[PDB]
Design a protein around this ligand. Structure first.
Ligand SMILES: COc1ccc2cc([C@H](C)C(=O)O)ccc2c1
Ligand SMILES: COc1ccc2cc([C@H](C)C(=O)O)ccc2c1
Length: 580
């Protein structure tokens, strides 16, 4: 009826305003905070005026016409987003499509730094404005963040400041919390970007297959009917969020959380905890829920999926069902596999049937089908064991450095900040996954690599530089990791010209936190590879150890700058000799 009334009634003023603030920040990432808050109140007012009189003018326009109209009222649009004004000429959905495409995955804004005194200050004098700002800062940095999940984090962030602002020593309560939360924002953001990237680049059918694999591992006791239903509904939730439809996305999400809690007995014993919780906790808890124990009545699969003579007839009849069922069954018994491994096994199952059923004796052919999955399984298992050995041997920083070398060799045309960001994210896959019980390491590692590879692809979408990267990013979602693992030193590379200043250090580096010192060195390392692509990881490890030693020394000196100045250029030249 009035779609905007309806959502307002369903969501209530607070959340309504929340999600409307996020939406606007993510669509207009540059606008001062004040204008968004203003645009938000205006829509909220119209919403209220509509809830009271659904028959009133323009109350029956769709949401996107309404928000699209509000965004296009914003002043200096053509100075702030010269590229956006254009979308404003268009109708809907054309208009929305246009804003979407214009979203910025790397607006490269200032780092959100916890200034606890000035933040506790700002919080006390106005809690609503302080939290609203938080949503804006985060939304505009992560224009595809899972809308409703941000309202959830903003609660945590509120609890953070509520506990630490009266607390004794302020920063030491608050700074480990805000760092922890930031880590969760970044992972959360990555998980969602992969979902939306999957919608954009591979379509729903791919998003559903992913979801079937995953939800079956999590809910191995639910039947297939029940899995299909949730996947159907969840896909619709994320489709909407990814399309910028946040109010509908949230409303649909609450519906699904309620469905799931009505049925937790047919779904999972692990939901109990989640279901006893308030709305936003509940959804978050369901979203992040752990895998239930395997039922003791899992069916052998030989019979229907390898022995049956009718398989061909069954498969031809309705492929997507028979295959979905296969995927449901294989995944439910394999929480020890990664989602992409499962999706790879499903394409091989499928590929094997396409093949065998075309042959004169399909049953003699498809009978060994499960034995084709073996190589699929051991390849990633050994790749994880290998990288976990290396990691436990050399620790995060060196593991990252090995990854930054590996990736700069694979894609030397990518900018150093990106190679560094990625190599660093990749290395944190080790820290996270390698310490886990052994059978969890494969799924952790690959599911996490998916997130980081997709981040590389996303950046690469805005700034394309390498064809090998394009190919891996666009070929097959399921083959993405194996496609990247397979790249080697790009042989067509032309060593970047040497530029002394790049590798020249100064005293300023001395008062950066460790975290930031590393990035400085790690950038130099990428630069070392670009200029000398053929040097082995071992030569680079040694040369960088020298650079590290030189920095420690000079920063420790009475005269830091004469140290850097006298020692640097010598180390700069001799180090090229070691990279021959
Ligand atoms: C309902 O059966 C399916 C449907 C689509 C799929 C897609 C993929 C990967 C993600 C792809 O690259 O398209 C894998 C397995 C699938 C099984
Ligand atoms: C368990 O820890 C890891 C961490 C990073 C990894 C990166 C890669 C990439 C895809 C590569 O190109 O080799 C593979 C495996 C990995 C396992």
């Amino acid at each position: 009826k009035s779609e905007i009334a309806h959502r307002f009634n369903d969501l209530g003023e607070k959340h309504f305003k929340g999600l409307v603030l996020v939406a606007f920040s993510q669509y207009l990432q540059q606008c001062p905070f004040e204008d968004h808050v203003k645009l938000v109140n205006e829509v909220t007012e119209f919403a209220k005026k509509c809830a009271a009189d659904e028959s009133a003018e323009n109350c029956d326009k769709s949401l996107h016409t309404l928000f699209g109209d509000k965004l296009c009222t914003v002043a200096t649009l053509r100075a702030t987003y010269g590229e956006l004004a254009d979308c404003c000429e268009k109708q809907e959905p054309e208009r929305n499509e246009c804003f979407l495409t214009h979203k910025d995955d790397h607006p490269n804004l200032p780092k959100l730094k916890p200034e606890p005194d000035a933040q506790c200050a700002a919080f006390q004098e106005d809690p609503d404005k302080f939290l609203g700002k938080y949503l804006y800062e985060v939304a505009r940095r992560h224009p595809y963040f899972y809308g409703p999940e941000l309202l959830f984090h903003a609660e945590e962030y509120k609890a953070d400041f509520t506990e630490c602002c009266p607390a004794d020593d302020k920063l030491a309560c608050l700074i480990p919390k805000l760092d922890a939360l930031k880590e969760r924002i970044l992972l959360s953001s990555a998980k969602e970007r992969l979902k939306c990237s999957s919608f954009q680049n591979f379509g729903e059918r791919a998003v559903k297959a992913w979801s079937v694999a995953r939800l079956s591992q999590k809910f191995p006791k639910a039947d297939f009917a029940e899995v299909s239903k949730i996947v159907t509904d969840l896909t619709k939730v994320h489709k909407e969020c990814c399309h910028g439809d946040l109010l509908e996305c949230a409303d649909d999400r609450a519906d699904l959380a309620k469905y799931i809690c009505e049925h937790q007995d047919s779904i999972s014993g692990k939901l109990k905890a989640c279901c006893d919780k308030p709305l936003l906790q509940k959804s978050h808890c369901i979203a992040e829920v752990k895998e239930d124990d395997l039922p003791s009545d899992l069916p052998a699969l030989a019979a229907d999926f390898a022995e049956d003579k009718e398989i061909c007839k069954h498969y031809k009849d309705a492929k997507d069902v028979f295959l979905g069922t296969f995927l449901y069954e294989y995944s439910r018994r394999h929480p020890d596999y990664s989602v992409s491994l499962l999706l790879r096994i499903a394409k091989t199952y499928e590929a094997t049937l396409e093949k065998c059923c075309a042959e004169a004796d399909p049953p003699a052919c498809y009978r060994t089908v499960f034995d084709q999955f073996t190589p699929l399984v051991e390849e990633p298992k050994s790749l994880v064991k290998k990288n976990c050995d290396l990691f436990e041997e050399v620790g995060e920083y060196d593991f990252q450095n090995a990854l930054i070398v590996r990736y700069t060799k694979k894609a030397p045309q990518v900018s150093t900040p990106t190679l560094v960001e990625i190599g660093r994210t990749l290395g944190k896959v080790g820290s996270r996954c390698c310490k886990l019980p052994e059978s969890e390491r494969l799924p952790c590692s690959e599911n996490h690599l998916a997130l980081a590879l997709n981040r590389l692809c996303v950046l690469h979408e805005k700034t394309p530089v390498s064809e090998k990267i394009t190919k891996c990013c666009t070929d097959s979602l399921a083959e993405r990791r194996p496609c990247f693992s397979a790249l080697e030193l790009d042989e067509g590379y032309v060593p970047k010209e040497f530029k002394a200043e790049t590798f020249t250090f100064h005293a300023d580096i001395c008062t950066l936190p460790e975290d930031e010192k590393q990035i400085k060195k790690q950038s130099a390392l990428a630069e070392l590879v670009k200029h000398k692509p053929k040097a082995t990881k071992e030569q680079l490890k040694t040369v960088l150890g020298n650079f590290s030693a030189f920095v420690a020394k000079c920063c420790g000196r009475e005269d830091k700058e004469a140290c850097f100045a006298e020692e640097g250029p010598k180390l700069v030249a001799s180090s090229q000799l070691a990279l021959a």
